[PDB]
Amino acid sequence: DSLRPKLSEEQQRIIAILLDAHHKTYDPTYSDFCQFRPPVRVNDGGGSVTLELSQLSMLPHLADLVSYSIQKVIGFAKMIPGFRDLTSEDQIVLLKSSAIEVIMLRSNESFTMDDMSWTCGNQDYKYRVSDVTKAGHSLELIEPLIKFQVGLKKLNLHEEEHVLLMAICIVSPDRPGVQDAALIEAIQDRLSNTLQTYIRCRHPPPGSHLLYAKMIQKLADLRSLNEEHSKQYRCLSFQPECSMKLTPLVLEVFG
Numbered sequence: 428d429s430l431r432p433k434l435s436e437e438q439q440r441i442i443a444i445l446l447d448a449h450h451k452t453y454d455p456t457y458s459d460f461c462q463f464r465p466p467v468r469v470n471d472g473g474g475s476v477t478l479e480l481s482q483l484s485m486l487p488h489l490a491d492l493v494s495y496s497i498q499k500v501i502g503f504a505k506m507i508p509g510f511r512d513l514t515s516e517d518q519i520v521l522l523k524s525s526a527i528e529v530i531m532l533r534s535n536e537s538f539t540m541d542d543m544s545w546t547c548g549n550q551d552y553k554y555r556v557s558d559v560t561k562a563g564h565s566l567e568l569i570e571p572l573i574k575f576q577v578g579l580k581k582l583n584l585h586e587e588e589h590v591l592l593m594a595i596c597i598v599s600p601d602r603p604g605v606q607d608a609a610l611i612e613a614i615q616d617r618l619s620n621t622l623q624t625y626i627r628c629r630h631p632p633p634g635s636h637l638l639y640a641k642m643i644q645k646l647a648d649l650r651s652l653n654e655e656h657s658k659q660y661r662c663l664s665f666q667p668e669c670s671m672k673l674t675p676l677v678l679e680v681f682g
């Protein structure tokens with residue numbers, strides 16, 4: 428039965444805009460990483476919550492990484508068809524609430540199953556579980572995060588599906604504090620319809636009209652990661668002098 432409408436003119440334009448937005452906002456050569464505060468990796472095979480919190484050795488580097496990435500996500504979001512129709516208030520509510528989620532999704536591009544790390548072109552910029560603990564996070568966030576990255580990789584998304592997924596994440600009508608939920612939902616539906624249509628015309632075999640449900644379940648998983656991150660960030664923020672180690676944008680988004 429399984430009908431396969433072709434992508435409309437407009438849906439094809441939405442995909443090209445999203446791909447363009449992504450390519451303008453994600454440098455796959457990682458060439459800006461030398462501009463961040465440098466990574467420092469203290470000795471911590473233990474690897475000791477007391478010590479991690481005392482030093483927070485990887486925090487200035489990873490806060491700079493995330494802060495830069497939030498800036499990129501803002502730029503990506505402004506190019507999503509319809510985002511600019513939203514009030515400024517709703518734009519910002521959507522950005523602040525999705526930031527960490529979009530970062531976790533876009534990080535999949537540097538994540539490698541070779542060794543279960545985020546590898547950004549060189550061993551100074553390879554991030555492992557241990558480097559995240561050295562920024563003051565705990566295994567209750569990191570291990571589910573890695574499971575998420577693996578499950579995502581194993582979907583083998585086309586770049587089209589990947590950018591649609593990021594856009595769908597940002598334009599979510601159920602975020603706390605949004606005012607025009609209906610408009611946001613309309614924007615999201617246009618994107619969701621484009622993704623469903625895409626998978627059905629363009630993603631082979633296909634028996635896997637399972638993929639759209641799989642993608643949606645990733646969005647649910649990201650919600651869980653987002654709350655756990657928020658809880659841990661709050662604990663991190665109790666560490667004296669933590670704020671120095673962050674950035675103004677990070678502080679505003681998560682504080």
Ligand SMILES: C=C1/C(=C\C=C2/CCC[C@]3(C)[C@@H]([C@H](C)CCCC(C)(C)O)CC[C@@H]23)C[C@@H](O)[C@H](OCCCC#N)[C@@H]1O
Binds near residue numbers: 538554568
């Ligand atoms: C951030 C990205 C990358 C990796 C992402 C990682 C690996 C390290 C640990 C990180 C940061 C997790 C912790 C829990 C966040 C903690 C945040 C605070 C401390 C504020 O609580 C969440 C995502 C994780 C590299 C890369 O894929 C992109 O990098 C720059 C853009 C790439 C290009 N071009 C992407 O945006």
